[PDB]
Subunit: 237 residues, 4 copies
């Protein structure tokens, strides 16, 4: 017996993912903490979840790999006996450069992680949360970026495109899953601390917590008529 | 002495405005309740604010009239000894028709209320909340509509344009006021109860409360890196 | 007898309006040249239309004034015996400043010209071009601005809002008038010559002619499935 | 010796690609016609190019395969002795269904073709057209879809995302390549003939030619200040 809802967060070992995990716990959720390689960081996130009063379940996996994604969801469901939500947050680290200089391996990693991975995880949430497929309803939040509308020229135009895909996914899947009890929204963070931040209207980089607040709001019941939204959290940029 | 912040809400006698007033009170705010003509409804909103634990100040005025707007803000400041926020919500009621059939008096009322009025109130908030003009910082939320992106053809294409102006105001003023301690966001409600609602992905019209939740979130401190956002609350449409 | 189509252009005495008039003439149109005060400049535009092979009809009027707008359209129809199109281009000149400093008279002029005026002219085109109201079909192009998405903070946030209204008008009216043989699109020019221009990706301000090209394309038959579009002409900004 | 510019069009064997090839030829271009499998259809497009007065070069290749993309560009350059433009148009055919039912192989094909392929081809155009990398400048047009903003729920939400990526690519790459003499734009076609078309404001599906007109305009010199644009060609939807 537990009246806490369960959220699976991808890329939850650091940054926005970690803050979201901890905040969701403070707000009454149990949390599946997915990570790719940094298991020690994931365990620190889990301890922070537990300290905040939540159950935590750590789960390794490549979001681009179908078998890993099915196992991730299966694992969280095993642990908590339920699944109520997904936060799509996994990303990659890549160097700043123009498209012309980017090698194909980097492009593939960017799209496989940010596009295919977000689709596979959203697909699994669709299968498991939709009321027409046996689920109890729920919410998905996709983490996008202001890069989707700004383009990250000379830096990460591939990342920019990947988040454009996430924005479009959000709009379409919200429509698709609305009749089946599942809301789908996105946050579009700007510059978030881990000197451009200083050039934004609020005059600073954002804190991961500040993005987490937006995520956890969109996951909760007070957001009940909010689906298909794209919520910029970028300091006015 | 009061640690409650003060928000002036325009068109607060009914609907989204009323729900926002009541919810803001439940969440620790005192509320200036502006109305155009329906004083009895405004007084009912005030009683609901007071019942929720807030101070309420009722204030009549045409948002399109500069003298009324200055008096509205002056009045709330008198009552509470402070101003922390504005919700731009005042609107008009107009019949459904194509642009070709709309009389000029209706067009003028639509734009004077939804465009000029929103600008005059935002201007006053800018004068009074900005840290560079003696204020303590704060937040503005503009109530827009999904009509800004859908166009309300054969119904209210003038209303649609007015909310397009509000979306653009939001973006620009967020940038303009960010360095001066003031966040500016908008909610874009869809169909909100006072049979199209049934054709939205969530399969129903929204409740005013559901929009109020989004407004009050954007007004509060957990939205601290969120400015310039346009937050759809339209059930997936 | 004339196989040339007729376009009424508002604010056609200078800049984008003038270039559009001249280019439309080069491309086979006759042109109504509306102006507010600068009759000498309008006459120079007319001579350029005539030199390019078109008939020209000069017509004074405030687009914000219903009687002037009805007379403008009546006049062009008298001159050419037909009306096929409208370019909504009239604007105002205003100084750069934050909203907080703008006087109410400036705000009113901005909105009356850019919002009410665009609606009254679009309304008249709707009445006269729509096939269900006796017209032969046609096209409307609204001149908006990239300011609608950028916000012109600390400069012209009122102008920004006005063009946000124009973008929304475009979307809605396109839907509304599609079944009645009338396409409606907008161009969103960036910095256009009459040192920010130097900071755009193409590294310069645009020429009025360059915007005129986009306008005249959207007016012509090769744009036959293009309606509701918002066409940025801003050098990548 | 030839004063005709050269454009490489991906997926040029049928539909929008074919119409663009033929129209570009009518308007003074030589054309590289890329195809994946349907060589007979590509040859028919080539004959239509030649009949219109252009040189044609047919070139097989998977846009998702780096070696094929480099060979495609190398081949066109060999044939014509120059490269001036790219139209990114290659796509896949997939059945209509909700995301939950889509198999992973279909998702991969969609993204590899519409996202990775568009990036690899755009990357090659960046390498070859940019003035800072030895090229003579030029233009890229990406073929997107109104699906990027509508989401294609219950049909092709993966395709929708892929075109969201293309829209973001367009914005970013326009900024990135503006200083190096290359414009980058997108067309977003709606329903285009190869009963939803009947429900659009213009009351019909569009013709491939109608999209080709928009593409060829964006490729030409009269579009000289137009870059980063997203040009809807969807009948008002």
């Amino acid at each position: 017996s537990s009246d806490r809802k369960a959220v699976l967060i991808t890329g939850a070992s650091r940054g926005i993912g970690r803050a979201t995990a901890v905040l969701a716990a403070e707000r009454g959720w149990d949390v599946g903490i997915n990570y790719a390689r940094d298991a020690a960081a994931a365990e620190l996130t889990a301890q922070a979840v537990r300290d905040a009063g939540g159950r935590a379940c750590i789960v390794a996996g490549d979001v681009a790999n179908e078998a890993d994604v099915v196992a991730m969801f299966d694992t969280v469901a095993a642990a908590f006996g339920r699944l109520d939500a997904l936060v799509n947050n996994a990303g990659i680290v890549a160097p700043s450069m123009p498209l012309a200089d980017m090698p194909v391996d980097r492009l593939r990693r960017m799209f496989d992680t940010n596009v295919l991975g977000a689709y596979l995880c959203a697909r699994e949430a669709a299968r498991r949360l939709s009321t027409d497929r046996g689920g109890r309803g729920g919410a998905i939040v996709n983490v996008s970026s202001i890069a989707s509308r700004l383009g990250s020229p000379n830096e990460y135009v591939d990342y920019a495109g990947s988040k454009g895909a996430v924005d479009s996914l959000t709009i379409g899947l919200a429509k698709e899953l609305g009749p089946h009890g599942v809301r789908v929204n996105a946050v579009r963070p700007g510059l978030i601390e881990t000197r451009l931040g200083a050039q934004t209207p609020l005059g600073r980089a954002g804190e991961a917590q500040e993005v987490a607040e937006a995520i956890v709001w969109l996951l909760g019941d007070t957001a009940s008529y909010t689906t298909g939204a794209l919520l910029d959290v970028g300091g006015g940029r």
